[model samples]
Target: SPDAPTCPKQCRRTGTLQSNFCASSLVVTATVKSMVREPGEGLAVTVSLIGAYKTGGLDLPSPPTGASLKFYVPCKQCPPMKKGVSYLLMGQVEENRGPVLPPESFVVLHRPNQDQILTNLSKRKCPSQPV
Candidate 1:
């Protein structure tokens, strides 16, 4: 019984965080509170909103510090995150749904020094993409 079928795996693309920043609808720094794996193929994660450089998709212009936010990650392992750690999350917004981190969304460790660069990216125009 040594040979058996292996479970599927999602190989995330190697894309720079800077390039993915503008493409995302929501970009913020947050501290993870918890992650719950549901019965179905769902991963529910909760985090406290620390700060935001972009929040175009969210209804509110800015969420105050320590405000709780939930993110639904379709693939739990593809973009892994741990509890009690801060992260620079780049995600999308769905109609009738809250924040979501679909496959390949940018989720990286957060640093205080990143604020300046993130602010610049938020105020500056994204490079044009030709059809």
Candidate 2:
């Protein structure tokens, strides 16, 4: 079951980003959106955000009507991600000035790591190396 290989049994924080007074933590959930293998490369999977919220149980900023967010995944987990796949994206938000809020759906991506480039190839093909 290579496609279903055991990932972190429990959700683990794998990334974090800060903007203005907002802070976020990217976590790997207990689910898999899709899986694929690249020739001479390792396995890649796309995991979507299923849950998220601000740290300390605070309310997070509202996502625009059709706005999208770009999150930076840890380099360690980059290449192993695929495009056009579903994922259980989750994370926590923290306010630099105010109290940290709980988890909530901050944003959504059709492909969690699709924009991520492996090479200079077009959007149709992922690069051999991670961005």
Candidate 3:
């Protein structure tokens, strides 16, 4: 097993939204409500989902509101997120833990009018209802 503390260059991903959508376990546009450092537990970023393209059976509600998802940043190399800022996060869910945002994951600042892409992807890929 590899034990590197940071992501290797080969593991780094670069792709379009379609590729990222196929690769990720969860894809969402969310606002960072807060971040708390939890020592061994990693950085917990509490986010409110603005919209979702895929949820990978995490059972997130539709029209997600008042629901908070925690994206765990396991190391310092993980993307830095600020409270109140929105992000387009493409990540995976751990078996026992919640969603995790690795340094190699697709994480970008949410831009104005960016929801159009998410909406388009959802219509193309996602089912009409949560599965």
Candidate 4:
């Protein structure tokens, strides 16, 4: 087996928060606890929940805080999440495969005072747009 895997050049505009939020099925804010690189597969990560916006109807603990959950990142460092930092994660809930931070997923650091906007976004309908 190889010691280091190579990641290819990936390009995509993050678009807008509204767009990403609406498109994603699983949304939450959490702090990274641990990360393991699965050489032949994907990045296995554990994170402690700050709050869960959309669960996609998964079985999770009540309140969702002080609870840890696992997520799979398709490519090494594609999402570029780091340990000990809280982030607003918007991604897919593939119960059959597990939650994933696909390259297209919207993952950003959780800024102060973002909780209000995120809460509102979770409750409000996605704005209609023509493109």
Q: Whose lDDT is greatest here?
A: 4
Compared with the true structure, what per-residue lDDT tens digits does model 2 show for residues 1-119?
01212233232333332231133343222234555552232343333433332234334358511222333332223323245543434334333322211222222342434223211
Residue 7 in candidate 1, Cα distance off native in Å: 11
Q: Given candidate 4, what's the lDDT at residue 27?
A: 86
Candidate 1 Cα misplacement greater than 4 A, ranges: 1-8, 61-65, 129-131
lDDT of 1 by residue, 60-96 (tens): 5353555788887766666767888988888777645
Badly placed stretches (over 4 Å) of model 2 are: 1-66, 76-79, 91-131
lDDT of 3 by residue, 62-105 (tens): 55645788887765445656788988988777656767776556
Q: Give the poorly placed runs of model 3, Cα more than 4 Å off.
A: 1-13, 39-41, 125-131
Q: Please provide TM-scores, in order, for all candidate models, with all chains considered together.
A: 0.81, 0.25, 0.73, 0.81
- lDDT at 7, model 2: 31
* Clash list (residue pairs), candidate 1: none
Error of 3 at 126 (Å): 9.7
lDDT tens digits by residue: candidate 4, 1-131: 12223444673437888888888888888898998886444677789778877878467755656787777776664666787888888887766655666667788799756777778888987788679
lDDT of each: 0.73, 0.31, 0.70, 0.74
The order by descending lDDT is 4, 1, 3, 2
